[PDB]
């Protein structure tokens, strides 16, 4: 719907004081321009549709760059498979947009963009590659080799991508064990007790679960070519059906780790005179 | 008319004569767990007037060089009677809070305090090692902690301090302190009011959580304007906190939790 219209107002001389207020009470003065100056009648057709939380989180964002190699396993120890633990906190833009709020609850849509490259094209040529993206939930076994038994995917979800295709896209529901996700957790996983040793009872400040959403395992299905081929798969993450619950100020310094810590990049504001416009 | 209030909970009574108003955080009064939102199945215990009463913490002193103070709930009430005993005996706990800050001064004094109630008030550490602050320093109790003026890095790798280093313009968490007013808040301005009242409901991503492991609310007192009095050499006025739990319920009863303190 549209915004409320500007009602016309004439001059005022009365006991009403809308301009005077008290911000000690913790409230914003709910003033409109007719309370201070004379206004005309304006029919407003502007809407707040783009400023909704769904439209704010409608754009996908890159969260990981996972790198795999296709090579003979006998030389130079190439990365025939690689595993990435799922988090948003290693890229700063989606982390800042999420850490505008404390609690959140959304479905999530993943998108995978794969690019390949030749290290040296003089060694030969290689065919079209097939990429397997295996979800590892927390508790499921981790692959140790690229041809391990864990890649059979009897219960783990898996996406097979042929190179040159449109990018692979899946969706997940709300998978949190709480009633909302927690962007901030003011606490510990375990409480130390009296009389026990110093090595027992320690935990991180704000970690909660150490393996909360699991890991993604990426490999190349095909056998080794004489050429070394490197591949990067980029994970794009888009929230949808979003509800948020506690507003927070946005981050003003560079991030330092998964927590709220800071080391450098302080003193962010520049120099500007008080009486210079 | 508005400037007088009388709060009563349990056997405790607070009367103020220069109040601004009372803030209910996010428009929600504290309440018990409804049957449509109840996750544990055992019968809760509700101590009522044994726990829902005003407890007075230690008094901090405001002076010119002071940069701020902070507290954690329900960590600040862990030694305060039957609420602390019901917290330490039970695995799960839920309580709303009424936070009352008291700071009086003469009409010739000036200064302003920002009383901020922060859900999940995480604080930054003192070292390069991430999330390394221990339980004993992150839960100080009724004494709270103090905001600092500048960031100082702990270089002791042999015996690290493992403490917070909260810088007051960075609000302890790297956010600008002028934007901390999106939290539910009141201002104690000494020409205007001598008290601030915040009513905080239970805010979490769960219906009930472990109180010993997790702090739901944090109370931050920061001087928005510095204290000054009559251009003399020194002045020092006190600040007193009085916090009452509201709508307490506890579920999982077992033996006592004695946390490690050092």
């Amino acid at each position, epitope marked *: 719907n549209s915004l409320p219209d500007t009602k016309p107002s004439g001059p005022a001389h009365s006991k009403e004081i809308p301009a005077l207020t008290a911000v000690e009470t913790g409230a914003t003065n709910p003033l409109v321009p007719s309370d201070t100056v004379q206004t005309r009648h304006v029919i407003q057709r502007r809407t707040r549709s783009e400023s909704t939380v769904e439209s704010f989180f409608a754009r996908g964002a890159c*969260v*990981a*760059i*996972i*790198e795999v190699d296709n090579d003979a*396993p*006998t030389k*130079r*120890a190439s*990365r025939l*498979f*690689s*595993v*990435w*633990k799922i*988090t948003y906190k*290693d*890229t700063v833009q989606l982390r800042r947009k999420l850490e505008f709020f404390t609690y959140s609850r959304f479905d999530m849509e993943f998108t995978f963009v794969v690019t390949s490259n030749y290290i040296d094209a003089n060694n030969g040529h290689a065919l079209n590659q097939v990429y397997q993206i295996m979800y590892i939930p927390p508790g499921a076994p*981790i*692959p*140790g*080799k690229w041809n391990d038994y864990t890649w059979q995917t009897s219960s783990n979800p898996s996406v097979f991508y042929t190179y040159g295709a449109p990018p692979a896209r899946i969706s997940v529901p709300y998978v949190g064990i709480a009633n909302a996700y927690s962007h901030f957790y003011d606490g510990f996983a375990k409480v130390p007790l009296a009389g026990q040793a110093s*090595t027992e009872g*320690d*935990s*991180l400040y704000g970690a909660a679960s*150490l393996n909360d959403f699991g890991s993604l395992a990426v490999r190349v299905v095909n056998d080794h070519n004489p050429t070394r081929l490197t591949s990067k798969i980029r994970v794009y993450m888009k929230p949808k059906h979003v509800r948020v619950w506690c507003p927070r100020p946005p981050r003003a310094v560079p991030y330092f*780790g998964p927590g709220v810590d800071y080391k450098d990049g302080l003193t962010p504001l520049p120099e500007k005179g008080l009486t210079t416009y | 008319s508005v400037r007088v209030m009388q709060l009563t909970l349990g056997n405790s009574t607070i009367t103020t004569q220069e109040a601004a108003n009372s803030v209910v955080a996010y428009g929600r009064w504290p309440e018990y767990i409804r049957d449509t939102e109840a996750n544990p199945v055992d019968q809760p215990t509700e101590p009522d007037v044994a726990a829902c009463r005003f407890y007075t913490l230690d008094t901090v002193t405001w002076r010119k060089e002071s940069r701020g103070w902070w507290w954690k709930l329900p960590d600040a009430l862990k030694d305060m009677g039957l609420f602390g005993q019901n917290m330490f005996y039970h695995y799960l706990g839920r309580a709303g809070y009424t936070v009352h800050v008291q700071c009086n001064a003469s009409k010739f004094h000036q200064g302003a305090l920002g009383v901020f109630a922060v859900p999940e008030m995480c604080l930054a550490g003192d*070292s*390069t*090692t*991430h*999330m*390394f602050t221990k339980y004993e320093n992150a839960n100080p109790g009724e004494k709270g902690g103090e905001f600092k003026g500048s960031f100082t890095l702990d*270089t002791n*790798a*042999t015996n690290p301090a493992r403490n917070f280093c909260p810088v007051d313009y960075l609000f302890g968490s790297g956010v600008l302190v002028g934007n901390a007013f999106v939290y539910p808040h009141q201002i104690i301005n000494l020409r205007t009011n001598n008290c601030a009242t915040l009513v905080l409901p239970y805010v979490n991503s769960l219906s009930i959580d472990s109180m010993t492991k997790h702090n739901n609310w944090g109370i931050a007192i920061l001087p928005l304007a510095p204290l000054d009095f009559a251009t003399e050499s020194s002045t020092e006025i006190p600040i007193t906190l009085t916090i009452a739990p509201m709508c307490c319920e506890f579920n999982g009863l077992r033996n006592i939790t004695v946390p490690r303190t050092q």
Partner: antibody
Amino acid sequence: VQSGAELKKPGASVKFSCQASGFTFTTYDIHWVRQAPGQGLEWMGMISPSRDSTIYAQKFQGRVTMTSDTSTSTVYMELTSLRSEDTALYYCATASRPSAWVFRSLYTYYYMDVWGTGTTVTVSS
Amino acid sequence: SALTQPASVSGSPGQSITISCTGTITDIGYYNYVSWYQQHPGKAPKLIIFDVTNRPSGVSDRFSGSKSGNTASLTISGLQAEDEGDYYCFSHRSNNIRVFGGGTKLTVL
């Protein structure tokens, strides 16, 4: 991976030299680990010649400076002042065995797998 | 700040032994970059386990590794006389500092 020499002097600064292959110089990181006799291993620092970034241990932050030379594919380590506890065997190692776990979300972690024959330095009068 | 290992482990040939490496949080208990090294006298250290349960090529299959909390364990099943030497634990600390263990001498009885 070859080590330069073996030296001895109290007090004054001692410069180390480690020459590697030209592929491994530009691609992988080079690590320094020292070993006192019977006292186990001790990490000293890292030189990464692809970007000339240095990370030092907190025990050796003030004393140890590391440089690189692209013309000879050789990295160097200088201890600015030496004490009698620094009598040890100093290894030069190349980190080329990678992890399957992605370091942060954009990088690859490497373990040491190729180790040099070492350098013995004695600090005694 | 160094990682904790027992000073000596002893065993007969044919038996199954376990060398334990206990670190802390922001360490073994946080990362999966836990590795093991083997050093015979006069030799450079040789990698025998690189990721937590994984072996490099050429390492014999009697070596195995595991992790439980802040503790990583190296298990040798079917001990032989050629396994006599020092075993070193290695992991990654969260302040980008790499840190070794104290070392465990293995004596084959």
